[PDB]
């Protein structure tokens, strides 16, 4: 699932992250977040994700998961 | 349950926490 895919995706890699394609000193220290510091756990009984992070990466990975589960289509064999 | 989900979420990680989205030096 998700809570294994993007966990091991950000394995290691003390690095910040950029932009998804399908004030300076304060903003740089929050832009000095580790990619490996993301910790994600699943929770089945409400079909939900528990994510955690700094003030932009919680907003950031919201943009990933909104373009990751699409409604699947039915196909009938004969 | 509850007492395992947010338990293992915060393993380690000596850090403060910010704000939930769905005296000064002492403070």
């Amino acid at each position: 699932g998700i809570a294994t895919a993007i966990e091991r995706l950000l394995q290691g890699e003390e690095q910040p992250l950029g932009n998804i394609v399908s004030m300076s000193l304060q903003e740089a220290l929050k832009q000095n977040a580790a990619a490996g510091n993301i910790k994600i756990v699943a929770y089945p009984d409400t079909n939900s994700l528990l994510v955690k992070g700094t003030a932009e990466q919680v907003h950031f990975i919201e943009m990933l998961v909104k373009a990751l589960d699409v409604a699947k289509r039915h196909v009938e064999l004969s | 349950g509850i007492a395992t989900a947010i338990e293992r979420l915060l393993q380690g990680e000596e850090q403060p926490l910010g704000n939930i989205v769905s005296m000064s030096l002492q403070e």
Binding site: P44, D45, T46, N47, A71, K72, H74 | -
Partner: protein, 102 residues
Amino acid sequence: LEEKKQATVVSRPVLLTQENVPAIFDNNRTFYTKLIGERNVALEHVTYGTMIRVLPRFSADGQIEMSLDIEDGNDKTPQSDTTTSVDALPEVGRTLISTIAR
């Protein structure tokens, strides 16, 4: 000798559950039929097994998605020796489905 045969059976299991939790059901009745004879006496009978295991979830737009696995049928029994006895109780093949559907 000539004969024509036609048989019908319609069955429904119903159950309810909550979202995101599993639910199991299975059933097997044993159905008999009247073999002709009280002193020269014998009987024959078949079961009808049915099993359903589910795990549902909700959507955003209102659709309901379910994860199905079902089994149904009788056991392979060499029995019912007389002619109308197999006519007396119909048979259905063993089956298995495994499919998610919204």
